[PDB]
Amino acid sequence: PSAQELKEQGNRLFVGRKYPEAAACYGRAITRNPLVAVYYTNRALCYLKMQQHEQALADCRRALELDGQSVKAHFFLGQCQLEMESYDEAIANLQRAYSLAKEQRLNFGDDIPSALRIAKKKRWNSIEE
Numbered sequence: 381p382s383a384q385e386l387k388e389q390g391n392r393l394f395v396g397r398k399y400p401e402a403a404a405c406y407g408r409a410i411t412r413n414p415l416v417a418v419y420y421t422n423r424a425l426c427y428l429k430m431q432q433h434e435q436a437l438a439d440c441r442r443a444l445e446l447d448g449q450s451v452k453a454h455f456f457l458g459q460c461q462l463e464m465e466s467y468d469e470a471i472a473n474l475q476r477a478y479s480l481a482k483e484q485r486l487n488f489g490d491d492i493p494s495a496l497r498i499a500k501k502k503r504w505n506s507i508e509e
């Protein structure tokens with residue numbers, strides 16, 4: 381199987397909540413072609429759904445090097461840092477995801493802006509404690 385076919389099989393497993401199996405298929409595609417960003421971005425989300433944040437950080441770091449303009453990778457990076465309460469970095473990454481989304485016209489409705497507000501509100505909440 382080619383790397384593209386492996387990404388498609390990992391995608392099918394992800395839709396069925398098969399997160400660990402999907403991450404294995406994404407690692408497959410990385411072995412075959414390790415220079416495609418979305419392979420890391422998709423597996424990062426698998427790790428993110430698996431409560432393994434440090435693992436999710438790494439893949440978000442790998443994706444943003446192959447594609448510094450990736451809206452999805454910045455979005456998962458910020459959400460991952462948010463769940464780890466790294467609020468300032470998280471808001472900065474969600475903000476850049478929003479900036480890139482408007483540049484590439486990937487800003488749909490109030491989606492990413494609502495993520496910003498939820499992150500900023502959670503940051504305000506923790507500062508008080």
Ligand SMILES: *CC(=O)Nc1ccc(NC(=O)C*)cc1
Nearest residue numbers: 391392393394395396397429
């Ligand atoms: C195709 C696919 O994976 N869709 C999808 C829909 C919803 C969610 N999760 C929630 O709505 C909370 C994940 C994936």
